[PDB]
Amino acid sequence: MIGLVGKKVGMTRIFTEDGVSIPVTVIEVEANRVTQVKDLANDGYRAIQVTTGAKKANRVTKPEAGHFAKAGVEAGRGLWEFRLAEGEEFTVGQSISVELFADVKKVDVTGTSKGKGFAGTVKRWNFRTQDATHGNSLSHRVPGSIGQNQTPGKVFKGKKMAGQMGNERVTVQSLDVVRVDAERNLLLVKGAVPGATGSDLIVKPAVKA
Amino acid sequence: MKFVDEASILVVAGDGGNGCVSFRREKYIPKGGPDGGDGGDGGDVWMEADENLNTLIDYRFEKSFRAERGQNGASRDCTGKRGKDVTIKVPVGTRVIDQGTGETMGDMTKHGQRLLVAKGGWHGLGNTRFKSSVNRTPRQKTNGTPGDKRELLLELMLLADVGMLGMPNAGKSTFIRAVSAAKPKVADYPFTTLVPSLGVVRMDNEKSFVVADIPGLIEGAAEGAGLGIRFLKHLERCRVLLHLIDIDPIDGTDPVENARIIISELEKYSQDLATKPRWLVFNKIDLLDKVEAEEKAKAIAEALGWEDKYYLISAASGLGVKDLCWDVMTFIIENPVV
Amino acid sequence: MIQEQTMLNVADNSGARRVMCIKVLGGSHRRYAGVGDIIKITIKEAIPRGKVKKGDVLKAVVVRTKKGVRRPDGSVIRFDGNACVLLNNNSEQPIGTRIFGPVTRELRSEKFMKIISLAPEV
Amino acid sequence: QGKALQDFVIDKIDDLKGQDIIALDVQGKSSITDCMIICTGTSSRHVMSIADHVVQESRAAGLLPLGVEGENSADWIVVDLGDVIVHVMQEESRRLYELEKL
RNA sequence: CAGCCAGGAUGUUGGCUUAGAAGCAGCCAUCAUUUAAAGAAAGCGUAAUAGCUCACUGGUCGAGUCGGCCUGCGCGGAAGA
RNA sequence: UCCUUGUCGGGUAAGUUCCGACCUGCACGAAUGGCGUAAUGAUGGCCAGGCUGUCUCCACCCGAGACUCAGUGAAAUUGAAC
RNA sequence: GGCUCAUCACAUCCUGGGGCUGAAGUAGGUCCCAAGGGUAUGGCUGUUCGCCAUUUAAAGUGGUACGCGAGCUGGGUUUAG
Ligand SMILES: Nc1nc2c(ncn2[C@@H]2O[C@H](COP(=O)(O)OP(=O)(O)O)[C@@H](O)[C@H]2O)c(=O)[nH]1
Ligand SMILES: [Mg+2]
Numbered sequence A: 001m002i003g004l005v006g007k008k009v010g011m012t013r014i015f016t017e018d019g020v021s022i023p024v025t026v027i028e029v030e031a032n033r034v035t036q037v038k039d040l041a042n043d044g045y046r047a048i049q050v051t052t053g054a055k056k057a058n059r060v061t062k063p064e065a066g067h068f069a070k071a072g073v074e075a076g077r078g079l080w081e082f083r084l085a086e087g088e089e090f091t092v093g094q095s096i097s098v099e100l101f102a103d104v105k106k107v108d109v110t111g112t113s114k115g116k117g118f119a120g121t122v123k124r125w126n127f128r129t130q131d132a133t134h135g136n137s138l139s140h141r142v143p144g145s146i147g148q149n150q151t152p153g154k155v156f157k158g159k160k161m162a163g164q165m166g167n168e169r170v171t172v173q174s175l176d177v178v179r180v181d182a183e184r185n186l187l188l189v190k191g192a193v194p195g196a197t198g199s200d201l202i203v204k205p206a207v208k209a
Numbered sequence B: 001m002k003f004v005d006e007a008s009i010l011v012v013a014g015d016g017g018n019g020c021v022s023f024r025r026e027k028y029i030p031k032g033g034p035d036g037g038d039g040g041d042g043g044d045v046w047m048e049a050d051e052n053l054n055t056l057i058d059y060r061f062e063k064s065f066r067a068e069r070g071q072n073g074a075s076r077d078c079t080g081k082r083g084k085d086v087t088i089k090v091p092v093g094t095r096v097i098d099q100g101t102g103e104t105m106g107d108m109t110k111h112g113q114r115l116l117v118a119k120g121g122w123h124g125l126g127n128t129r130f131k132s133s134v135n136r137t138p139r140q141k142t143n144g145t146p147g148d149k150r151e152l153l154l155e156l157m158l159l160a161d162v163g164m165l166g167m168p169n170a171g172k173s174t175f176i177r178a179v180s181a182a183k184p185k186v187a188d189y190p191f192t193t194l195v196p197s198l199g200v201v202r203m204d205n206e207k208s209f210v211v212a213d214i215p216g217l218i219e220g221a222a223e224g225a226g227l228g229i230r231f232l233k234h235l236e237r238c239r240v241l242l243h244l245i246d247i248d249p250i251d252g253t254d255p256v257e258n259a260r261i262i263i264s265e266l267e268k269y270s271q272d273l274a275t276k277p278r279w280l281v282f283n284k285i286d287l288l289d290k291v292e293a294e295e296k297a298k299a300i301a302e303a304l305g306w307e308d309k310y311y312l313i314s315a316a317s318g319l320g321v322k323d324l325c326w327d328v329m330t331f332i333i334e335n336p337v338v
Numbered sequence C: 001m002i003q004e005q006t007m008l009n010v011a012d013n014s015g016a017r018r019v020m021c022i023k024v025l026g027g028s029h030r031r032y033a034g035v036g037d038i039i040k041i042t043i044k045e046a047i048p049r050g051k052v053k054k055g056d057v058l059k060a061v062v063v064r065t066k067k068g069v070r071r072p073d074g075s076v077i078r079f080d081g082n083a084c085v086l087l088n089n090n091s092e093q094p095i096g097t098r099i100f101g102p103v104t105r106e107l108r109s110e111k112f113m114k115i116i117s118l119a120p121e122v
Numbered sequence D: 001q002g003k004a005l006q007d008f009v010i011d012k013i014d015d016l017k018g019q020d021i022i023a024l025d026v027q028g029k030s031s032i033t034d035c036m037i038i039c040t041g042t043s044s045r046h047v048m049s050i051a052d053h054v055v056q057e058s059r060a061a062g063l064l065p066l067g068v069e070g071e072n073s074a075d076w077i078v079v080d081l082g083d084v085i086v087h088v089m090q091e092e093s094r095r096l097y098e099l100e101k102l
Numbered sequence E: 001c002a003g004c005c006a007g008g009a010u011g012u013u014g015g016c017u018u019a020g021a022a023g024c025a026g027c028c029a030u031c032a033u034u035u036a037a038a039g040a041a042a043g044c045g046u047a048a049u050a051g052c053u054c055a056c057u058g059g060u061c062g063a064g065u066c067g068g069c070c071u072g073c074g075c076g077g078a079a080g081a
Numbered sequence F: 001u002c003c004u005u006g007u008c009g010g011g012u013a014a015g016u017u018c019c020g021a022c023c024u025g026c027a028c029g030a031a032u033g034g035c036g037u038a039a040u041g042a043u044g045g046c047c048a049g050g051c052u053g054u055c056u057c058c059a060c061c062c063g064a065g066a067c068u069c070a071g072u073g074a075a076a077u078u079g080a081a082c
Numbered sequence G: 001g002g003c004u005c006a007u008c009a010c011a012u013c014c015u016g017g018g019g020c021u022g023a024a025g026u027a028g029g030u031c032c033c034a035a036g037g038g039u040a041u042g043g044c045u046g047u048u049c050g051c052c053a054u055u056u057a058a059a060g061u062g063g064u065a066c067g068c069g070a071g072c073u074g075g076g077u078u079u080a081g
Helices: A062-071 B057-061 B172-176 B258-267 B292-303 B321-334 C113-117 D002-014 D044-060 D091-096
Strands: A004-015 A021-029 A032-038 A047-052 A078-083 A106-112 A169-181 A186-190 A200-205 B007-012 B045-050 B064-066 B086-091 B094-097 B114-118 B149-156 B162-166 B199-204 B207-211 B240-246 B278-283 C006-010 C016-024 C039-046 C057-064 C083-086 D019-025 D035-041 D077-080 D084-090
Touching (some): A004 A047, A004 A186, A021 A200, A032 A062, A078 A200, A106 A186, B007 B057, B007 B114, B064 B086, B114 B149, B162 B207, B199 B321, B207 B321, B240 B321, C016 C057, C016 C083, D002 D019, D002 D035, D002 D044, D002 D084, D084 D091
Parallel strands (some): B045 B086, B162 B240, C006 C083
Antiparallel strands (some): A004 A021, A021 A186, A032 A047, A106 A169, A106 A200, A169 A186, B007 B149, B045 B114, B094 B149, B199 B207, C006 C016, C016 C039, C039 C057, C057 C083, D077 D084
16 A cells, blocks of 8 residues: 655664564654555556645745645645545545554565765675785775677676665565654664665555465 | 295496586686586495395396486586486395306395495596696596496395294194284195295293295106195295104105105205204104003104104194293393394 | 584583584475584594594584574573584584583473583573 | 462372472562472383473363473473473483472 | 267186286186177286277168378478587 | 505594504606705695684674765767567 | 685585375385475595585586686796795
8 A cells, every 4th residue: 555754763673572572663654645546548557646845935936836726735845646545535634643553563664775976896896805915916805897799799797796876675575563653753663674864764564465 | 925036136326427528608708717526426336135025026027226326527626426326225134146257245144234336437537637837727537436236136035033944734824823923825635825924923022033934845856746846945044944844644654664765855955054953843743642642652763763752732723832932032141142 | 602613612521622513404405404413523623632533524413503492471591602522423512521501491302401401501 | 370380280190190299489589480290101112202292281181391402302301381401301301300409 | 981879798716837927927728508799808006806999790871981002292310509 | 566544653532634663665867967964945744832704603893995966078889678 | 736706507515396106104215397495514635626524505527718817816836046
């Protein structure tokens, strides 16, 4: 079904009566106000467009302000949408709260992971490090060979070699939930979610078993 | 699992990996050292017992077993891998006989024993091992040793702790229809059971014995009377021998001489079965009165010269079958194999 | 955190005193050993009058780890001197009659509670 | 469930030829075991027969045993019933180990 | 021709090797006479027994069927970076 | 000279290297010197004890380059190239 | 030859689907389809290979000019002593 958009706050643990320590990530989810609903007649797929957070009206641009004024909803930090599950209906201007996660017991979390810059090949795919002795000269962490002698005449596409980490969407599958905070608007999920503190996250019910 | 057969196989051991002669030639220099290595040791054959297998049916199917021949030597001073040792799964209690004044190799009594039957050939030598100064160009190599070949007569013979032999259609299979868990085919006609379907009796924990079935036979030195020496071969490790004699056969002659000749033919089998302690038990006692079959039971004993307890056993009726088992079990325990 | 070619102590009266495990088990590319594991050892120093002799290769189970264990409540049980108990190669029954030093409770989950029955300390 | 389970096993193991039983109190000495009861068997078959019986009835007794030790070997086998531990043994290997001050 | 509805019996459990084989483990002189269309007989299931069957014929359907020869074009034999 | 690295022992769980020895070995070989030799050697080979990122398995940090800006300003090579 | 890096074909080492079996069940043996993934750690020797020690599902076969020094190594081969 549909999902929500929250903000990463931090990681903590929950202590249980029987003595089980379960790490938990604090997700701040606010009232998700939908902005417009797409149907088969208009574009050919069912999706509800939703926003969250608050933005100062100073830099809220006219195209963004006009779009928000069309639905009668206030400004939001960012704008997203979710796919419907073929049989549920929603109305524009409705605010989506958090209690719907009280029964899922499994949530998929997506977001932009931490950027690690132009990382090395030994870091991006755990390339084994060459010997730092026994005559080795000017080559300690270099990838080394990248092809074959004159038979391919090139380097194949998709080669695992030095690149840039982070700043990309990362998905963690079937993250167990701990508690759902409705009166304070917090989401508690067991484990570690991608991204740093203050980064926007998308949480959806788990699609796997 | 309804027939028992015996046959012979031909096992061949792989000869050793032959040596190689070579001379390395680099991309620029045309003269190089006498490159090349040794061969691979020939694969051996191991004689391993198996619980799951109980016959030699696959051995009639396959009369030849080939061990892996040792790989030849190669360049870059390469030595071939030793041939894999072929292991043959055999039922326990097998005896193997050869030709040319051949004899037994070793008796199998427990599972897990692996017997060395065929020794594979051993690897040869390459030109590199002949390195020297005066020769300085070794063109000589040593041929691999030939493998060992022999023909094995696979004789299967059961682990019958308790062996029993009785009159034809006297209830030998019916005696197994007792507490014994085996289910041999039972019918009134003579020689009802032909396949040896051995059974086991478990009176209590830590104590049990196995009982085999061997059909009766008529007095014949050769293979006459349908059955003969080919069934007597399953004997000779039976620590106790049980003799079954019918009482008042419905149509056969009453035992006064036929019960004596069966003892005589046991002497001429190979060695009188080493004169093992034989126990004589009776059958067909529920047909007549219990007290009537008492005086005539002992009369047979001195008629045949028997001075034992002459146990009275009712195999079909089930009376006294437990009494015989108690007596034999104490005798088994007090006389361990030594 | 015991690996291939690791020198450990001995925590039973079997006869070994200084031991060197040679093969950690568990699967292909088995990196390191935890607290309850089957690890193969080679005897390097033992009393000549003991039950075992130097150079024998057989299986053993680690009881104490320098790195420690992981309690499910954010706790570790570190030790000073990695130790093993002697076990037979064909059978998993331990050899030593007595066990020296404490044994952690985590060995119950690994299904070698017999060691826990010995070693009265913990 | 201390003495109730203790009396539940000693009587029933005796009905299956349970010889030379020793009731031991270990409270205050070990924090993992409560009561040490010792059972002796004639040989490998006897100790295995009683070991399977005690775990078979435990399945129908509600409590689940937490593990077994005897595998392809009857030299030492011991099974647990939670708070109470039961040791079924044989004559030969008992004197090899130490008795009654564990 | 192949199908469908039936026949398959008789002197006769065919003599030795035969414990048990009697068309179906080992030999055939290969018997022939009864009504005829059917053999002391090619195959299952055992040890035969008892039963499934076949060549053959009878009835119905009613127009091609049977396998040797030469040849054209095809199929498998023909798995590698 | 060969076969089963020659095969037994130490060294190792596992030792084509090392150490005195079995033999089917005798060529050298006695100032183109033979045997043993304490000490000595940035000499060849092997082993042991302490020790450690040599390694499983790399991680972090400190500095100089690598990067951007401002100034000066090469090189080997090049038949022409969309 | 070793280290880093891999790729491709299936004449498949395991996992997967089956046939036959002289396959009672487990355990097996042969053949067919299937390349998605995985496919070892140490002593010896420079080693390729191989022996041995010990695990697992195995420790696959070949092309890559028997891949890879404008990536490393100079241990073998190695001019000059
Ligand atoms: N009434 C009675 N019949 C028996 C007894 N023992 C055997 N029989 C019968 O004897 C018949 C033949 O026995 P069988 O298995 O052929 O013995 P075998 O001749 O040695 O092979 C069976 O059908 C039994 O019914 C007995 O004790 N009492
Ligand atoms: Mg019978």
